[PDB]
A paper describes a structure:
Human Pol III consists of 17 subunits that are organized into a catalytic core (RPC1-2, RPAC1–2, RPABC1–5, and RPC10), a stalk module (RPC8-9), peripheral trimer (RPC3, RPC6, and RPC7) and a dimer module (RPC4-5). The cryo-EM 3D classification revealed two distinct conformational states, which represent a PTC and an EC, respectively.
Structural comparison of Pol III EC and PTC shows well-ordered strandNT within a narrow exit tunnel in the PTC and an open exit tunnel in the EC. In contrast to that in the PTC, the strandNT is highly flexible and could not be evidently observed in cryo-EM maps of the EC from our study and others. No such interactions were observed in the EC. In contrast, the DNA-contacting motif tends to be flexible in Pol III EC and V465 is positioned away from the bridge helix, possibly due to the lack of stable contact with strandNT. The disruption of this contact leads to less stabilized FL2 in Pol III EC, as evidenced by the weak cryo-EM map of FL2.
Numbering used by the authors:
A (entry chain P): 186 to 315
B (entry chain A): 3 to 266, 275 to 522
C (entry chain G): 2 to 131, 145 to 162, 184 to 201
D (entry chain B): 1036 to 1132
E (entry chain O): 2 to 177, 229 to 321, 336 to 465, 491 to 534
F (entry chain Q): 21 to 88, 102 to 119
G (entry chain A): 1334 to 1377
Write the structure that this text describes.
RNA sequence: GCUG
DNA sequence: TCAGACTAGAGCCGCTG
DNA sequence: CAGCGGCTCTAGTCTGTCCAGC
């Protein structure tokens, strides 16, 4: 019902406890939180002026399923009704990066030789080389 | 001082090699990009738009307005091409039956041709032999396709390769995931294993998982054909210097010069191009509007149909909600047919220095003679080149001029190509200034070799050459002994006359 | 100077059928290849000999006679080792202009290499002092056609000494 | 043009063409069906085999391979209808010898 | 794969010459072709074709075999020619795994193609001594020690036995004592070892530092007992894992055993089939991250979650608006990442159907991006081909006005920005090509 | 008419771009070798020369190029550390 | 197929405007000029 | 539609 | 209007293993 | 006992039907 909402304002609020991560030491298993994330979702996040102070788990879990697609923890045991193992872990990027300026341009893909878009004189590599 | 240059490089055609342009060679021929749908400006000045069709950078088809690219008139200009960008790829309807053939030969997963190494070597050896006929190449292609159509697994990647076949007008389908009474293969089971959420919102998906099959389409087959190895392209019988598999699907389209499609009834060929331009703009707007995929598919299908109709307007399988209300000339319809370029403009064509009249008998003529009326003889002229034997004869003909029968209509100077119309000026001055090498277009006179022909010709004797003799009455006349070759009967019959305009054409007419 | 073997298809118009071919081709080929530099070849001058003249066709159009002609023509092309003798037909401040005597006024020497008293100061000073000799140094020709000069040379003057004239 | 109203002229049909072949009349068939109808010249580039204009080839961006060929205009028209169909007639030209 | 052949024309042009490229690239274009047929079709004289094939068989790019006609048909393997692009990377990991001596061993083995032991140790006795102190001469015995030390870990394998066919001539291939036997480098062992760096960087930059090292020591003790065609590594026990740990670690057996059952049970999964299958999707995801922002990358990961559930959930499962989302789908469609609507089962109707569902196909999006990355290095080299021939006037002046020198340092900034960028796209090739080779049966 | 103005654009600018010269530190090592072997592969024995220049030159003359410590000890060890196939 | 068409045949000769081989086109005419082939050369 |  | 000699399919039965 | 394969058969479809004049 809440189409007049920007969850992109709330995506950082459900992210910043997973960037800090006190006790990164490996003294134990470090089976990591999803219930406290549901706990911080219900009473109070970081501060924001919010019209939907009513707290349902069906409207609050959806910000996670976007943020898994923004590289954050998978679901462990959500088969339970309210309380089970629910293991989670924020995924740091598994690769570096892999591209170049010429990987960005769709129209500049056409060329194949010195032509109208020949790469011997493209603007993009001229921009990248300074 | 000056550099050497050859004066006049006349050459002789040795062969025509047919082929196809790649989409990025089209951009190198074409002089402009065409983007605008409107044929004309709205205001009363009646100019065409700068970047739409009818732009005079692509030539001209009226003497009133010159071409922009070379600044030359209709008579001097060869014409120049533009291009249209297409936002989605489309099948070319002439190459469509060849697109399926390749997809029956190549593996759909890694684009290698599905043949054993020994089979590939045998086919390469058949290609290697010199003197191969065009029929032999077509026969070889059929054999290669048959061997591929009997294999169901690729020797190179291992992926399954079911049947490729047509599934309606300009659509292709591939049975990559067939179902059998025997235990289902893992890949097909994995493909439909768990679309539970899709099943929940779509009732039709759950009952017949097997029916859904790989819908090949221009966005996929263009991506396959870029990946076919150049070693395997000769075994598709494509000549790799005339074209590539990638060139079949077209993401670009040339628009012909204006002289191919002249500005006057009211031109509708330009409207067909405008419809394609309008659809491309609409499809881009729909993508910006975030319209549903089915709406995008319908717009894309319309774009494919319009391009196919533009190349050929005679397609059989057009759905009722897409059929043209009116018939229109596609390119194929102006090539084919009796009025088509091959028969109407090439095999048989209208000729000048020709005449027609009723025929009537005259037995006092010899069998090699035909009476030509003065009204035809004053019109049908022969270019007599001035030389030492005829200078004093042609002077008297120039003096008589256009209105007296042994006379002349035009005079032309030695190294000049304009013609002085001899009705004006003082002809006794133009007769004195005859030089050797001038051309006098004298009237037809007694002893001209003239061709004579009845309209239906069943044998060679229906057209013969006769010596003209000028006589006052309007009919063509010949001795009735020559009625049997022409099958003429003097009952208001008409016959044709042709005046050969060349000395070499006189001799071949007279002797043969 | 160097001979250049060339092959041309020479068209004799049919009002010259009285004259002998090897003469009447030669009158045409002089009108085809005189005072004309051929790119990468040199400045053609005249006709040396016609080494092979083959048979006179007559084509389905013209009625003229087209004989393919092998010949040799003398051309002008310095060999990058020639000390020529010309005349200064012009002096520019960037470099002198020498001309071979009524041959071609198109040889343009750049002047940087003679003795350290070198300038042309626009009052037609040849050289600040201590027929004219020339060393042709590079071949340089530019094909003219480009849209809908040409043998220029660069010419040197080293420490020759020039005993007769400075 | 087509007829008497338009001062049209007369047709050498496909059947009259068959008559003239049987006489062996090769030059008369060239005079009637090329010279006195639709004689034309095209610039042909010997490198790519396409048609050009004014001694210039836009495809190659060069001026040196272009040559003039005597062609019927209806065949030039055919060679531009076919390219828009993406059937490319790439010509090769020898000298006339 | 025409852009692949675009590179083999570029790679031979810069390294050896032009006719060795031409006769080379034609052989890639027409395949199993005899000696006289190659010289007639490329328009090359037969003396130069015999030399050009002689250099090509030396660097192991063209392989010859006769079957029936008694006439040898040469044949060039395409994928070997692109491995020249990885050549300085093949140098570097022999510096991390061996000394400067053995790093020079794989260098002149990659450079001069086929080498005997009696030559390659004699050559590095020249190069390493001329850079070391005179009078402090490097002793060649340590070279022969590290020469076999490469071979016990099987980084250098020997050439297959020569056919010695009558058409083939023995005297021409060697360049001018003992004969010995020849070898190339085992670059296939590198493609394991480059994959060994790939998985250990995949775990360390995702899980933890201590998780990756036990993957490394698992794979370091499974080198000879597998090959590249192994679907996964040889199975090991956890007790020899505690034996094979490095001496830098001090972790107790039972805590790492908890991490061992942690690392065995992941979404990542040592399953070498799943390892390159998971690393390839991150290479895909790092390209949409490179190109279409994090918003389109968010729906790109959504189709890797659900196979065929699309356009009735993708407006909901990412919460981005319908206008902004549907341009990201059609841009993922038009650039062939989103693959297609393989679920429509209503008959022949774009308007009336069972609703087309998007679905990523991982290999069609793989083979395109590999074809794209082959196209990419064509635009890299040709620029460095472009900027070279102009500036040759001032390279020899050092061997000079202020814009003259400034053009050189903008050249040398450019070339070093180009040549470094040939390698950063090169690591995307191998990361995807090893995924290509892992899903290809019967090869 | 909405697009009938000019060539769409001389170029289309993508609001997001390339990241950087990625992997900045360590490819200084490979990057010099890119230029090192290219200095040595061109100046190698395994290359060809333009003998078409010399057949093009009819100006051949004299005085031009157109006209004109390994400290080691013996040993012998031949290892089969490698494959025994093919 | 990328087929190349020989312009030798009768029908394509009439299309292209070149004279057909059969009939009067089968042979060539040489002019009987008073010529001396391989003429005396100027000695160097 | 008719003439050819 | 009237074939008409192509192009896939649906089988079919019976050896072909 | 089962599976290619060619046969064999429907039947499906696209392709022509003189020259010319007004
Ligand atoms: S350089 Fe060549 S390839 Fe790289 S972007 Fe510009 S055009 Fe496309
Ligand atoms: Zn024009
Ligand atoms: Zn395959
Ligand atoms: Zn061209």
């Amino acid at each position: 019902k809440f189409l007049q909402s920007k969850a992109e304002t709330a995506r950082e609020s459900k992210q910043n406890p997973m960037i800090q991560r006190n006790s990164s030491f490996a003294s134990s298993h470090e089976v990591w939180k999803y219930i406290c994330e549901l706990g911080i979702s219900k009473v109070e996040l970081s501060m924001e002026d919010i019209e939907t102070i009513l707290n349902t788990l069906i409207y609050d879990g959806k910000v996670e399923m976007t943020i898994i697609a923004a590289k954050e923890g998978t679901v462990g045991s959500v088969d339970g009704h309210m309380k089970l193992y629910r293991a989670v872990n924020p995924i740091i990027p598994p690769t570096g990066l892999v591209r170049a300026p010429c990987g960005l341009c769709p129209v500049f893909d056409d060329c194949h030789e010195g032509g109208e878009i020949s790469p011997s004189n493209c603007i993009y590599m001229t921009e990248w080389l300074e | 001082k000056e550099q050497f240059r050859e004066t006049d490089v006349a050459k002789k055609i040795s062969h025509i090699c047919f082929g196809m342009k790649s989409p990025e060679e089209m951009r190198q021929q074409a002089h402009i990009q065409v983007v605008s749908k409107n044929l004309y400006s709205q205001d009363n000045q009646h100019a065409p738009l700068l970047y739409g069709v009818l732009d005079h950078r692509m030539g001209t088809s009226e003497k009133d307005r010159p071409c922009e690219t070379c600044g030359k008139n209709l008579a001097d200009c060869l014409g120049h091409y533009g291009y249209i960008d297409l936002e989605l790829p489309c099948f070319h309807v002439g190459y469509f039956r060849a697109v399926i053939g390749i997809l029956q030969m190549i593996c759909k997963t890694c684009c290698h041709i599905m043949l054993s190494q020994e089979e590939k070597k045998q086919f390469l050896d058949y290609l290697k032999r010199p003197g191969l006929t065009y029929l032999q190449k077509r026969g070889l292609k059929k054999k290669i396709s048959d061997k591929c159509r009997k294999k169901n697994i690729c020797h190179h990647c291992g992926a399954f390769n079911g049947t490729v076949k047509k599934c309606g007008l300009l659509k292709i389908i591939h049975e990559k995931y067939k179902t059998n009474k025997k235990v289902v293969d893992p890949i097909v089971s994995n493909f439909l294993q768990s679309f539970e959420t899709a099943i929940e919102h779509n009732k039709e998906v759950e009952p017949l998982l097997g029916r859904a099959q790989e819908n090949l389409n221009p966005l996929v087959v263009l991506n396959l054909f870029k990946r076919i190895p150049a070693e395997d392209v000769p075994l598709l019988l494509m000549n790799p210097e005339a074209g590539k598999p990638s060139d079949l699907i077209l993401t670009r389209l040339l628009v012909p010069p204006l002289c191919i499609r002249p500005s006057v009834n009211e031109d509708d060929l330009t409207m067909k191009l405008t419809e394609i331009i309008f659809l491309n703009d609409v499809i881009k707007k729909h993508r910006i509007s975030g319209a549903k995929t089915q709406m995008i598919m319908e717009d894309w299908d319309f774009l494919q149909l319009q391009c196919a109709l533009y190349i050929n307007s005679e397609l059989s399988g057009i759905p009722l909600n897409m059929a043209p209300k009116k018939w229109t000339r596609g390119f194929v319809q102006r090539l084919k047919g009796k009025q088509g370029r091959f028969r109407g403009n090439l095999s048989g064509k209208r000729v000048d220095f020709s005449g027609r009249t009723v025929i009537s008998p005259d037995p006092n003529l010899r069998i090699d003679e035909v009476a030509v009326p003065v009204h035809v003889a004053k019109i049908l002229t022969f270019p007599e080149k001035v030389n030492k034997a005829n200078i004093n004869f042609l002077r008297k003909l120039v003096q008589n001029g256009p209105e007296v029968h042994p006379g002349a209509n035009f005079i032309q100077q030695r190294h000049t190509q304009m013609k002085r119309f001899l009705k004006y000026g003082n002809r006794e001055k133009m007769a004195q200034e005859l030089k050797y090498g001038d051309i006098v277009e004298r009237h037809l006179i007694d002893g001209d070799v003239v061709l004579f022909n009845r309209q239906p010709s069943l044998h060679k004797l229906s057209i013969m050459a006769h010596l003209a003799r000028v006589k006052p009455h309007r009919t063509f006349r010949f001795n009735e002994c020559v009625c049997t070759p022409y099958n003429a009967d003097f009952d208001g019959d008409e016959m044709n006359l042709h005046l050969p305009q060349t000395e070499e054409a006189k001799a071949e007419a007279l002797v043969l | 100077f160097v001979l250049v073997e060339m092959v041309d298809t020479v068209r004799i118009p049919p009002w010259q059928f009285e004259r002998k071919l090897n003469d009447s081709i030669a009158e045409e080929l002089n009108k085809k290849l005189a005072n004309k530099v051929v790119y990468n070849v040199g400045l053609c001058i005249c006709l040396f000999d016609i080494t092979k003249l083959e048979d006179a066709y007559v084509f389905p159009g013209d009625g003229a006679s087209h004989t393919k002609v092998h010949f040799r023509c003398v051309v002008f092309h310095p060999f990058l080792d020639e000390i020529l003798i010309g005349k200064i037909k012009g002096c520019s401040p960037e470099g002198v202009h020498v001309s071979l005597g009524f041959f071609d006024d198109i040889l343009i020497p750049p002047e940087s290499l003679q003795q350290p008293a070198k300038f042309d100061e626009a009052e037609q000073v040849w050289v600040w002092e201590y027929g004219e000799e020339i060393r042709f140094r590079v071949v340089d020709e530019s094909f003219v056609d480009t849209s809908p000069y040409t043998l220029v040379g660069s010419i040197s003057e080293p420490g020759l000494g020039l005993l007769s004239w400075w | 043009t087509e007829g008497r109203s338009r001062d049209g002229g007369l047709r050498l049909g496909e059947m009259e063409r068959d008559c003239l072949i049987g006489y062996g009349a090769s030059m008369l068939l060239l005079e009637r069906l090329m010279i006195s109808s639709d004689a034309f010249e095209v610039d042909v580039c010997g490198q790519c085999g396409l048609l050009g204009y004014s001694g210039w080839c836009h495809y190659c961006k060069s001026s040196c391979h272009v040559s003039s060929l005597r062609i019927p205009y209806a065949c030039k028209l055919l060679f531009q209808e076919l390219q828009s169909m993406n059937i490319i007639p790439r010509l090769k030209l020898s000298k006339y010898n | 794969t025409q852009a692949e052949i675009k590179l083999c024309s570029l790679l031979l042009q810069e390294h050896f010459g032009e006719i060795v490229e031409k006769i080379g690239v034609h052989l890639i274009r027409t395949g199993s072709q005899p000696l006289r047929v190659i010289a007639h079709d490329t328009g090359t004289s037969l003396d130069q074709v015999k030399k050009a094939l002689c250099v090509l068989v030396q660097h192991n790019l063209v392989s010859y075999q006769v079957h029936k006609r008694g006439v040898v048909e040469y044949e060039a393997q395409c994928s070997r020619v692109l491995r020249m692009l990885r050549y300085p990377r093949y140098i570097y990991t022999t510096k991390t795994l061996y000394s400067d001596t053995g790093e020079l061993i794989v260098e002149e083995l990659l450079l001069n193609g086929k080498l005997t032991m009696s030559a390659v140790v004699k050559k590095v006795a020249d190069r390493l001594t001329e850079t070391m102190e005179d009078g402090k001469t490097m002793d060649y015995a340590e070279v022969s020690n590290t020469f076999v030390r490469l071979a016990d870990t099987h980084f250098v394998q020997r050439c297959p036995s020569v056919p010695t066919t009558e058409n083939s001539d023995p005297g021409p291939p060697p360049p001018a004592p003992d004969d010995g036997i020849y070898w190339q480098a085992n670059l296939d062992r590198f493609h394991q070892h480059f994959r060994d760096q790939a998985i250990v960087s995949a775990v360390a930059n995702r899980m933890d530092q201590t998780s990756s090292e036990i993957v490394r020591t698992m794979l370091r003790m499974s080198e000879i007992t597998t090959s590249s065609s192994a679907p996964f590594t040889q199975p090991l026990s956890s007790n020899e894992i505690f034996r094979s740990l490095p001496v830098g670690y001090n972790i107790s057996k039972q805590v790492l055993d908890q991490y061992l059952t942690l690392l065995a049970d992941d979404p990542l999964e040592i399953n070498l089939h799943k390892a390159l299958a998971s690393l390839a999707t991150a290479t895909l995801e790092s390209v949409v991250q490179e190109r279409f922002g994090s918003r389109c990358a968010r729906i790109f990961r959504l189709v890797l979650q659900k196979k065929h559930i699309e356009q009735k959930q993708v407006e909901d499962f990412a919460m981005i608006p319908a206008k902004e989302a549907k341009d990201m789908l059609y841009k993922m469609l038009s650039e062939n990442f989103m693959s297609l609507q393989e679920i429509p089962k209503t008959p022949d109707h774009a308007p009336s159907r069972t609703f087309y569902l998007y679905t990523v196909n991982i290999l069609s999006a793989a083979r395109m991006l590999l074809h794209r990355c082959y196209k990419s290095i064509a635009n890299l080299i040709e620029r460095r081909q472009f900027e070279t021939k102009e500036n040759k006037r001032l390279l020899e002046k050092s061997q000079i006005t202020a814009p003259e020198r400034q053009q050189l340092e903008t050249l040398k900034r450019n070339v070093n920005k180009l040549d470094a960028s040939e390698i950063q796209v090169d690591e995307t090739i191998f990361l995807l090509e090893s995924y290509i080779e892992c899903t290809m049966k019967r090869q | 008419f909405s697009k009938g103005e000019k060539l769409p654009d001389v170029v289309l600018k993508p609001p997001p771009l390339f990241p950087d010269t990625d992997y900045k530190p360590v490819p200084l090592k490979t990057g010099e070798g890119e230029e090192y072997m290219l200095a040595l592969k061109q100046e190698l024995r395994e290359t060809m020369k333009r003998m078409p220049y010399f057949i093009e030159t009819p100006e051949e003359r004299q005085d031009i190029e157109r006209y004109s410590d390994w400290r080691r000890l013996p040993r012998e060890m031949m290892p089969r550390n490698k494959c025994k196939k093919a | 197929f990328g087929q190349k068409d020989s312009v030798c045949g009768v029908s394509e000769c009439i299309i292209m405007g070149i004279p057909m081989n059969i009939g009067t086109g089968l042979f060539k005419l040489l002019h009987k000029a008073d010529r001396d082939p391989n003429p005396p050369k100027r000695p160097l």
